[PDB]
Design a protein around this nucleic acid. Structure first.
Ligand code: 7MB
Ligand code: MG
Ligand code: MG
Ligand code: MG
Ligand code: MG
Ligand code: MG
Ligand code: MG
Ligand code: MG
Ligand code: MG
Ligand code: MG
Ligand code: MG
Ligand code: MG
Ligand code: MG
Ligand code: MG
Ligand code: MG
Ligand code: MG
Ligand code: MG
Ligand code: MG
Ligand code: MG
Ligand code: MG
Ligand code: MG
Ligand code: MG
Ligand code: MG
Ligand code: MG
Ligand code: MG
Ligand code: MG
Ligand code: MG
Ligand code: MG
Ligand code: MG
Ligand code: MG
Ligand code: MG
Ligand code: MG
Ligand code: MG
Ligand code: MG
Ligand code: MG
Ligand code: MG
Ligand code: MG
Ligand code: MG
Ligand code: MG
Ligand code: MG
Ligand code: MG
Ligand code: MG
Ligand code: MG
Ligand code: MG
Ligand code: MG
Ligand code: MG
Ligand code: MG
Ligand code: MG
Ligand code: MG
Ligand code: MG
Ligand code: MG
Ligand code: MG
Ligand code: MG
Ligand code: MG
Ligand code: MG
Ligand code: MG
Ligand code: MG
Ligand code: MG
Ligand code: MG
Ligand code: MG
Ligand code: MG
Ligand code: MG
Ligand code: MG
Ligand code: MG
Ligand code: MG
Ligand code: MG
Lengths: 98, 136, 48, 96, 170
RNA sequence: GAAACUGCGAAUGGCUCAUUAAAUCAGUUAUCGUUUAUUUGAUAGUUCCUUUACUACAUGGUAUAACUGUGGUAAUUCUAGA
RNA sequence: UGUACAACGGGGUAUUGUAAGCAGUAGAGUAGCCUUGUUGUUACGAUCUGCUGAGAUUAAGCCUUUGUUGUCUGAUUUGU
RNA sequence: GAAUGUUACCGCAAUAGUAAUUGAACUUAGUACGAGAGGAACAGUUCAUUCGGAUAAUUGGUUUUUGCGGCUGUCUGAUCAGGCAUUGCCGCGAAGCUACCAUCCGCUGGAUUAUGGCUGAACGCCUCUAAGUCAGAAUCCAUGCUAGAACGCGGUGAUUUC
RNA sequence: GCAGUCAAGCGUUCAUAGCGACAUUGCUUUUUGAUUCUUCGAUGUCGGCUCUUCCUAUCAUACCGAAGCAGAAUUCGGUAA
RNA sequence: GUGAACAGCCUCUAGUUGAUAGAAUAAUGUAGAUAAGGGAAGUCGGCAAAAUAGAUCCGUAACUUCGGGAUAAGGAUUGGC
């Protein structure tokens, strides 16, 4: 069960909802409803239509806490010497000097 | 439908009543197909026989290689315009009305099919599957 | 109460839509427990 | 989680957003019947046992629901749960 | 779907096939670079945090970081970019790519351990495979062993024993 | 000395005669109107900093193929994660 | 005289698609004064932007309600 | 809708009406049959036509939600907010109504016909018939479904004091 | 217009699988006539559209019987509106 | 005022606010409208209805009595500041 999203508005299209358009270049366009569907056919440009996802994105609207800092990282610090080099002679070889 | 069309066909909304003219999507030289009938249709007083994507119709050629013209030949609707609905619940529609000229068996005439094609047409007609790049 | 839509996988071996999802209309009817306040008997008669 | 299923899992009753139009919320046990029934909403309706045992293969099919639409029927419904609506739009002028 | 998982510490890598879509479903609608909490993957993976590094969907097409989408689209490629190896000078090829947003269409998900859980995994934290090669250049030897260039690199180069018949070499 | 990186070549060759009628092409000019790998010959004491507590010159930096190993695809001189 | 009913107000749902006001180094530009400029200043300019997915409408045959106010005995007629 | 005491609830069912249709593909089967060329059907499955009864989750249509936004002209000094143009115009538009333009549903017993039979005389034989009898059709009667006789009916509740 | 009886013939042979001459018996009243009873102080006087019902001399769909029916196809007939 | 305009639409002056009324909003209508896909298959017949339309620029066929045909046809363009 794929919930699709509108190729105009951007809202999720749940099963059965909305309409599907196969353009002549065989590019597919899905609409959640008649509103986007018409507005698409009207040659409106979504980045000019205030309520579309494209619009709010392009205009940077409401992304605040998704722009904040995050902690994702790791720690290893291990020793697994060169292969066939007898790693039993590769440990006592490095404490270094300095 | 009904002759050389392997498998069956779930009912699809009828976009093409007789007299409709649809684009010809193959390389046969035929520009358009004027629908004079629909194979395997019904009868009701004053009802226009209609065709849907995947149906076989008898048609003619209004614009085309003059060797295709003034003659009746079978054809298969590859693309609708009218919004139809599959069992998976989607309401979908193509941009144009289109079909290709075909022999009664359901074998093509030309070797290529320009533009996308419905799966309902594809699943149904083997030869169409061959020449069709973009399904649905 | 009204209606809604349902999606389920179809089991109908032989159907083109076998094993594939189908959206389906349904109805809902609110049916809180009925309560039994009596019982009447009936006899057969040549009239009914 | 009436409207929840094995596959859906989100806890929700069958009642659409803002409720059933013209009816209410369905706060009790219910029957869900495939397709459309005679009579209009709010009407007293009898559900009767079948008068014959049917084989038919079209019946007898045991079905399990995947997902039931809980979206609003009073408009072009988009969201299912009130959570999913706040999820997707985010914070609004009233809100917190 | 299958999981191709990798421990970047040990160098160990093992695959795990996961049925039961609910367990799989944790990864859905998720990007490359996001981390996963492995309690929901199963109880063997409890406490492990993963990384989605890529993978191949059905038909095997690779993913690409940055493309977003849960789909498969066609892109023009150039040198020094993923999923393209140019066969000629300044050769570009438009090829198909699969999106970076995880979906049920994926046959295999590429995963990279971040942190360790409470249970040792059979082929991963259990076994460790040593690095293939040691330092070659001048200071890299110095800086692998922290030698403070005095210490005469030639002593500190790594040697690999190999046996030729009854004659073993270095 | 496989593979691979790197450098160079792949713009020569060979084939064909479709277009082309002041175009090509021919002879004859022009660059005081330009680009030119290569070959050949010439051509480089200067690189730092308010210029004693000083800059790696006994030479500074990683990031990658090949390789190892885990993978996908019916399928290609497809390729991914480690 | 009560999970009573009603009229409003609140909340959900839904429609449009960003209100009035104020502000800005947004704005093709344009004037007026002199201390004739080392952003010179006061303003004016279709439009743009921010406050603002805001403002408006939403039962009239939508959902809901611990808030508010009010209503809760008039008329006729019936017997084996 | 008067009157068969009043009033209410639950039922019965006379009589009347009645409804479903047709096709194709898979499979059977390249089988039966045939020298070949050709080439079926019964059971099982998937769909389809014409018909009917619903229904509005979804999709489409409708727009005085004159709901929101836009636009022309003019009028209110300007702004705000509005008025007028037979609903001024336009885009979107919920609700309702609605569409093989949308979705759902359309029941199973009996008795027969033609016909093919059993037993079996007339007529020592023979015969489906004379007596008696079996099987049988898109037919028929029911089942089911729709009304409910306003002069067909049953069960049950409450039955008035100025 | 439709259906009979007799059976010389057609049908390779064989009257009646399917047909059928010469004759002859009938039915029907969507043919045309014949007549002129009814309406001339008026029964709107082609065709189509539309909707209902009825008829069967059944084109199809159900079940049968027959064949010059191997199969396939088809033809003749019964119950059938 | 808009505009080419004594057109249409809005206003000043002046004059009206006269046309039984109330409540509803079934069928059928009369008058105004909209319809997915198809596009005259409807019908005696495109009846009706729809489409077109101003202006600037570009472009413009047969044929002709040379005057025409001709806004032929076919195109682009239009606000605000
Ligand atoms: C309609 N009618 C009319 O007006 N007068 C009547 C006439 N009666 C007749 O005898 C007759 C013969 C020919 C004709 Br036409 N009719 C007419 C039929 C009629 O009923
Ligand atoms: Mg619309
Ligand atoms: Mg709509
Ligand atoms: Mg007709
Ligand atoms: Mg012509
Ligand atoms: Mg081919
Ligand atoms: Mg509702
Ligand atoms: Mg709704
Ligand atoms: Mg050459
Ligand atoms: Mg680097
Ligand atoms: Mg009150
Ligand atoms: Mg805004
Ligand atoms: Mg009403
Ligand atoms: Mg309050
Ligand atoms: Mg009395
Ligand atoms: Mg076969
Ligand atoms: Mg033979
Ligand atoms: Mg019928
Ligand atoms: Mg119907
Ligand atoms: Mg308005
Ligand atoms: Mg204005
Ligand atoms: Mg202002
Ligand atoms: Mg006025
Ligand atoms: Mg007027
Ligand atoms: Mg609607
Ligand atoms: Mg029954
Ligand atoms: Mg016998
Ligand atoms: Mg008998
Ligand atoms: Mg008898
Ligand atoms: Mg007898
Ligand atoms: Mg029947
Ligand atoms: Mg009976
Ligand atoms: Mg029934
Ligand atoms: Mg009664
Ligand atoms: Mg009674
Ligand atoms: Mg004779
Ligand atoms: Mg014979
Ligand atoms: Mg003879
Ligand atoms: Mg006749
Ligand atoms: Mg005559
Ligand atoms: Mg007469
Ligand atoms: Mg008279
Ligand atoms: Mg007369
Ligand atoms: Mg008269
Ligand atoms: Mg009369
Ligand atoms: Mg008359
Ligand atoms: Mg009619
Ligand atoms: Mg014979
Ligand atoms: Mg018979
Ligand atoms: Mg009848
Ligand atoms: Mg009868
Ligand atoms: Mg009057
Ligand atoms: Mg009036
Ligand atoms: Mg009135
Ligand atoms: Mg009307
Ligand atoms: Mg409209
Ligand atoms: Mg239309
Ligand atoms: Mg057209
Ligand atoms: Mg035409
Ligand atoms: Mg016609
Ligand atoms: Mg005509
Ligand atoms: Mg015309
Ligand atoms: Mg006209
Ligand atoms: Mg129009
Ligand atoms: Mg002309
Ligand atoms: Mg301009």
């Amino acid at each position: 069960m794929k919930v699709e999203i509108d190729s105009f508005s951007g809202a999720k299209i749940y099963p059965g909802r909305g309409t599907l358009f196969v353009r002549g270049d065989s590019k597919i366009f899905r609409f959640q409803n008649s509103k986007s569907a018409s507005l698409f056919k009207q040659r409106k440009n979504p980045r000019r239509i205030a309520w579309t996802v494209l619009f709010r994105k392009h205009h940077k609207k409401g992304i605040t806490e998704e722009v904040a800092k995050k902690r994702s990282r790791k720690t290893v610090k291990a020793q697994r010497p060169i292969t066939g080099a007898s790693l039993d002679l590769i440990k006592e070889r490095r404490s270094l000097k300095p | 439908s009904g002759n050389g069309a392997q498998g069956t066909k779930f009912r699809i909304s009828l976009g093409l009543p007789v007299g409709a003219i649809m684009n010809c999507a193959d390389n046969s030289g035929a520009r358009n197909l004027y629908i004079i009938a629909v194979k395997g249709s019904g009868s009701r007083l004053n009802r226009l026989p209609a065709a849907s994507l995947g149906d076989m119709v008898m048609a003619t050629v209004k614009k085309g290689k003059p060797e295709l013209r003034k003659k009746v030949m079978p054809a298969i609707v590859v693309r609708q315009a009218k919004s139809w609905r599959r069992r998976d619940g989607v309401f979908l529609y193509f941009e144009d009305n289109a079909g290709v000229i075909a022999n009664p068996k359901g074998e093509m005439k030309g070797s290529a099919i320009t533009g996308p094609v419905g799966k309902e047409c594809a699943d149904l007609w083997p030869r169409v599957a061959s020449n069709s790049g973009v399904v649905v | 109460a009204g209606m809604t839509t349902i999606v389920r996988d179809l089991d109908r071996p032989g159907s083109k839509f076998h094993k594939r999802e189908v959206v389906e209309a349904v109805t809902v009817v609110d049916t809180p427990p009925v309560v039994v306040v009596g019982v009447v008997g009936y006899v057969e008669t040549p009239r009914g | 989680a009436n409207g929840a299923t094995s596959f859906d899992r989100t806890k929700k009753t069958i009642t659409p957003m803002g409720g059933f139009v013209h009816y209410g919320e369905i706060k009790n046990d219910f029957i869900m019947v495939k397709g459309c029934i005679p009579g209009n909403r709010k009407r007293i309706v009898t559900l009767r046992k079948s008068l014959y045992t049917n084989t038919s293969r079209k019946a007898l099919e045991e079905v399990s629901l995947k997902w039931i639409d809980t979206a609003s029927k009073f408009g072009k419904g988009r969201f299912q749960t009130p959570a999913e609506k706040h999820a997707f739009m985010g914070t609004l002028k009233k809100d917190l | 779907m299958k999981l191709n998982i990798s421990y970047p510490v040990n160098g160990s890598q093992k695959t795990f096939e996961i049925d039961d879509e609910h367990r799989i479903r944790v990864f859905f609608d998720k990007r490359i670079g996001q981390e996963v909490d492995g309690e929901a993957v199963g109880d063997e993976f409890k406490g492990y945090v993963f990384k989605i590094s890529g993978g191949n969907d059905k038909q095997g097409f690779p993913m690409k970081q940055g493309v977003l989408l849960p789909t498969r689209i066609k892109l023009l490629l150039t040198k020094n970019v993923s999923c393209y190896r140019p066969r000629r000078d300044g050769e570009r090829k438009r090829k198909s790519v699969r999106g970076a947003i995880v979906g049920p269409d994926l046959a295999v998900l590429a995963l990279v351990i971040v942190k360790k859980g409470e249970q040792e995994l059979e082929g991963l934290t259990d076994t460790t495979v040593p690095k293939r090669l040691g330092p070659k250049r001048a200071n890299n030897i110095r800086k692998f062993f922290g030698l403070s260039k005095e210490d005469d690199v030639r002593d500190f180069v790594i040697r690999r024993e190999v046996t030729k018949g009854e004659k073993t070499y270095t």
